[PDB]
User: Fold 2-Cys peroxiredoxin, putative from Plasmodium vivax Sal-1.
Amino acid sequence: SPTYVGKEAPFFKAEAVFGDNSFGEVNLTQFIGKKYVLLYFYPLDFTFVCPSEIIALDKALDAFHERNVELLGCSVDSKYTHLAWKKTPLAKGGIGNIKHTLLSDITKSISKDYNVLFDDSVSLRAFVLIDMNGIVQHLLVNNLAIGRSVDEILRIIDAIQHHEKYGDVCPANWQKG
Amino acid sequence: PTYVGKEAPFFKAEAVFGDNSFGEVNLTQFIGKKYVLLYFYPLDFTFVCPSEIIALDKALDAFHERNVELLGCSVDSKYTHLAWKKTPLAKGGIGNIKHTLLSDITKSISKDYNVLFDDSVSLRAFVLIDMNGIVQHLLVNNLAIGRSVDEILRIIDAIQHHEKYGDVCPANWQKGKVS
Amino acid sequence: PTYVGKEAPFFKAEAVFGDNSFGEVNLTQFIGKKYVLLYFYPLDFTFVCPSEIIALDKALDAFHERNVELLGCSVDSKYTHLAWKKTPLAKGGIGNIKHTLLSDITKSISKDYNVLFDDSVSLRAFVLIDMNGIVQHLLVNNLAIGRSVDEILRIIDAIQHHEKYGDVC
Amino acid sequence: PTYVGKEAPFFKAEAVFGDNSFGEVNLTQFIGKKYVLLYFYPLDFTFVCPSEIIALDKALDAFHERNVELLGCSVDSKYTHLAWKKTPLAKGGIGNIKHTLLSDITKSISKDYNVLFDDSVSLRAFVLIDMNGIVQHLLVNNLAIGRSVDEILRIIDAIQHH
Amino acid sequence: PTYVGKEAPFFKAEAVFGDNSFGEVNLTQFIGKKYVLLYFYPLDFTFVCPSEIIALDKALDAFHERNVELLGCSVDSKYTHLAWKKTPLAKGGIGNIKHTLLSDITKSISKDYNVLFDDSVSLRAFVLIDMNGIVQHLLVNNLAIGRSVDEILRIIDAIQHHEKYGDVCPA
Amino acid sequence: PTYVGKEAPFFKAEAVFGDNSFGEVNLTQFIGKKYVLLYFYPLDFTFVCPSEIIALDKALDAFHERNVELLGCSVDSKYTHLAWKKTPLAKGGIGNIKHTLLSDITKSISKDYNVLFDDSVSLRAFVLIDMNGIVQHLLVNNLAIGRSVDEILRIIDAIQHHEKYGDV
Amino acid sequence: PTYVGKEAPFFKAEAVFGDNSFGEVNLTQFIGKKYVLLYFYPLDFTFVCPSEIIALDKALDAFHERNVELLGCSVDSKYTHLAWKKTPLAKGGIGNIKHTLLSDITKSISKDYNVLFDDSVSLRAFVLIDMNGIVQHLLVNNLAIGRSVDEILRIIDAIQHHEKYGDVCPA
Amino acid sequence: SPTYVGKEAPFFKAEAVFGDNSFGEVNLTQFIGKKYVLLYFYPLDFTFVCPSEIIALDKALDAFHERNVELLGCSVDSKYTHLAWKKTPLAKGGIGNIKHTLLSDITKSISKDYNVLFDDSVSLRAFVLIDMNGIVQHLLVNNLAIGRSVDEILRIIDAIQHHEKYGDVCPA
Amino acid sequence: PTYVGKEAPFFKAEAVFGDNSFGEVNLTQFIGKKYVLLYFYPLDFTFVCPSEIIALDKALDAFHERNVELLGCSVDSKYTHLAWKKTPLAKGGIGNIKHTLLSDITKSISKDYNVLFDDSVSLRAFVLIDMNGIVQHLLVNNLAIGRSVDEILRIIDAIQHHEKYGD
Amino acid sequence: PTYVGKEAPFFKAEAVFGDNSFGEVNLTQFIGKKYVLLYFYPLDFTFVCPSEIIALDKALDAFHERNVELLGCSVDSKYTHLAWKKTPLAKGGIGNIKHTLLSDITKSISKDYNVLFDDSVSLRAFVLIDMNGIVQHLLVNNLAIGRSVDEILRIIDAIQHHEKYGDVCPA
Assistant:
């Protein structure tokens, strides 16, 4: 019943499409003690709204690698729909050959466990940062095609990674605003 | 069970107003009238400076210009909230902030919004409720890392314009069509 | 308990029509007006050739001649259905089919018809609902084997013939 | 919920073999050996002609060729079945069919296969079980419309040609 | 608890009449009008000869003189009952019997009368129901031993006599 | 679900023997040894039908010839059974019958055989049990019409013949 | 919880009256009319001499002087009670007693008064019921030890004295 | 829920006031194999009913000891009220210095297990005879204060004890 | 959850009045009319001297001034209470006290007030009920310690002052 | 059922000590070593002057003589306690008190001691725990009426004397 923020992240095992367009599986436990995980959710593939979030995030993949972050995208669509969305060029409504992994939440189980499923149908637009000990440090959930700059995401990870070492930092001139 | 995209859970609380008087605030006074930015923080009087509260208070006119009511919330009593306002910044206080602070003395608001940690204190969170009473945005932080007020105002502006937020859409991207 | 010979479970679903517009199909919009051939298949964009959907669309006027509404159904979103229509047959697409494809996005239609597999996708199936909303025929396949559209037509003609004249050879 | 793509419900029944001998049949005797085509029909001795049972019997070598055991099933007793085989076609019988007829005297097989109509007789149905005991195909009909023997053999061949 | 000496369990079954037509018989059509001799047998078309059904049908007028309706019953369908009547006695059939045969296809009558064996078929049994719908006699046999019509008629007569002229037996 | 064609319900009753002594009888004594003809009657000391018990005892040799144990049973105590045997025939007694009378004082035997009426007394019934302990025949009468020993012995002969030669 | 000091459990029973005729007795026929001494005993025709019943019947006029109905009760049938009255004392009977014996054939009276032993027979007991239907005295004995009729009469006298005069001492 | 007559007497453990006026504890198992127990209940101490039965039983204590029976009194009052009633003279409605034990059923559980509690408050007047095997042979329950002669009690005890050794005997 | 600051649990008991008659009292007869000081004690006739009951009775006029009904309560019967009143002060008794003593013979008042110990006797307690039936003060002692009557009167006056003015 | 006369409910709380440092206090740490006077109060920074907290700390050496650990408890956090200690008496504060303040931030301690009011704050209450961990005294007040430190010390003295000697007859 209570939030998983600040507690161990709900376990997931999911079929996935990798950068090389091969199929496989991804479970959360494979990253514990090794990588930070930025798990993001989005409603559907092949929509009339531009997948600017997926495309921009993949353009910044080296920034996530620098920060030891595994970027994982996730929707309720099948692995076959994700693969097809990749094999569809941008000018024909696709996302192209993105190098990060896309997870298929075909049973909707992952969206339910993360509290991001809307109307027992599709996930909401959401970002979940999981640290190397498997604890959730940050959760963002949006309803309306909002939408988040990649620069903001990298700054949050930086602020969290620095907080893990140095704790709370009182800002200079905080009394102004 | 997520309330994001659905109606916001009802809340009623005793509060400390900008003028330091006590009164009551409930969600129904805003429905069909104003947007509401409800933020949560763990406690008053900790060693964590209240930089976010001061940054939010400085932007109070920016919030009012865009028809949003700013509400602050912790698990402390209204008496503790008043005492924190009466402590100056220089001595680890908030000073006479103009926006309203709610007292979640029973922990019900925190429980209903899913931001209560270990049955004790709320986490650092932001909830944007629209004028129809529907939750559009939810941010939950486990750490005292801060949030830009410009970014909050950018999210509000995106929702109120029905315009998209994030990075620029690539020029070459065009929705698919038949042969 | 089988729904065969009993009232067909009700369904309401978002759909992609032949003109590629989106809408809603309700089972009650056909009661007392049209026969319904509700068919199920697991997923769009798979490596299995979609010859069944195409063969069924080639025969759409045979279905209309017999007063039958042909409805296709899978757990994919309506957006994926539309995209699959816009994909060429060379790239495993279905083309601009004139019949309606229903989106069982919640998976409840597949559950109600007892064709959902592993809480994920449907099995391949055909359900023929008569003009009083009664299920007269059910076919469920666990493999990608296809079904002759000529057999579907023979079955429809047979059930329609028996509904009028009974059963004597 | 559905047994299609899962293990077929176990069955054990008394039976009338092709040679009019009485015996017993159970699902487990075919597992890892024969494919099973289990068909259901409401009753013996009705006024609806048994063309389907006759059409299926004509095709018995085709079934044997594909390692398929053809099993007919009704709610009637083994004594009714034999009596129906001793009745000629002109007199509304089935004659000396060579495939086996099972007696679902308790109605359990019909219940376990979800084909019992009311608590009386079963519906018209076909169930193809593979050599691992998994159901690969289910067809249920409310009316006496019949099924093409050619379609049945074509289904069997799609399953046998991976 | 037993239904003997209490009201007879209600039944409604499809039946094959003496003229080979199909219909329906329910228990309440005889209440206040006739006594009912309901008899059960396991199956039609068995290797045990139907000498009892044939013996009982020859005594049909003896039963009608006593105002009793003779009903036969098995778990077989009405079609099997008709088929068995259309089969000649030399080929193991019952021929064109004049009394009605009920079809207990669902098995509910045999269950209610406590004569269903192994959830499959009824046992050989006789039940005499009076004009008030009360069961006065029950006989249940496991084997094919039969029952004389003279004993059946003697029981019916003794029951009819005891109902009105005192329930005392003889020395 | 009836017990006819199945194993007969077990009983272990107090009883009055032919010699007028007391003891116990249980079903298990007879398995693989004797057929049992267990009969039920409602009450002792009524003037309705003591003649049936007397007639049955007159036929004991006929019962023993077929290897059948005749056991009578009612809900009366063993003391009531003994008193009834010690009563002269002209005052309604049964006399010194040689067969055994079981006392079903708890009413559990009549309940298990489904012959107890209104939680008071048993109805008039006959139960034939074979040497393997299976109930082959059951008769239950709501009225005091009685039953000839000739009819009973015919059934026994027919059941024993069928057990030897099958159905012919 | 006991019924002593509360309304006595209701009973309706077939009975053998002093004149050897059959009938019925219900508890409510005595309410407002008379006191009821109800006694229980295991069985008729046992080898335990029925000295208590004979002693009780000798003082029947003493029970009538105090307005009390003496009622005997066992799990035996009324037919057995009548036969026990028709058997002489020499042969282990009770003879023509003048008081009523009730039949508890269903065993429900012994169950209601909590005197049934091992789902079979009653224990030896005495119950005194007021004209208002309240139980004032209960005595239960596991053994065949007898009870003085003088003690029974002295107790009834005390309850009747108390009801008029209330509590007074000694003794 | 049948009677305990002819069955094991329900176990009891209670604080008590002994004949010597000291406080102690008594339990049923201390008598098994050793003595018969005559357990009597009465509602309350210090009522307007005079305690003639308690006085009569105590004068006959030697007759009870002669036939190996432990006389035990029991009510729902505390051990302190029992002692204060022994300390009250007979002229003021007390019981005086009685020599047999009085048990305090302060939780009302002894009265409940013995089925003599009335309106979850006080017990009725009752006598229970428990044999050496812990079996209840006799149960007397009165609603009113009508007494019971010790001669009658001793006749019953003697009759039970005689039956237990020698079996059934018919009177003269 | 406690009843302090909430409606006092209802009670009805047989009682021994100051005149030594037996009667009945229930809580509802005081609501809107007077304050009640209900006090509990385990037992009558113990070796703990009943100086608290006697001291409370000497102050009966002080309680009546403040419109408070003093009520004593134990699990003993009304007959024990009367016998204890009939016992001289010098023999360990309480004498002819004028205030009412309630008999909690079923022990339900002790259970409802949460002062019953081991399903046997009440602990020593004091409960102050205001004219609205609300419990304002509760004191519970496990030992024969005593409570000065002046401390009790100071508490009643402080509660009555708060009701008229405040903190 | 109450805990008075029984073992005191266990508690583990975060605490603000006399030296303004943070720590943890456990109930088990005092068993067999000290007596514990645990007191509850609604909230810090209220408009009711904290005269009680002040008086109790001014009398701290009286509690040390009797071997009693004085503990104050509220539903407030440890940070609110410290802030209240760091506020002068003139501005509504408590000042640098020498006794320990416990934080019942989860409200579990107030719930376990049955002093929580409407799932928000505690009532004013005093609990005296034995050196064996047994609760001997409990006081609960719905209003801000206060309690002299002389009454509190007199009760502790009385409880400690009762442990050595029994009750004292005169008063």
In short: Chains H and J do not touch (no CB pair under 8 Å).
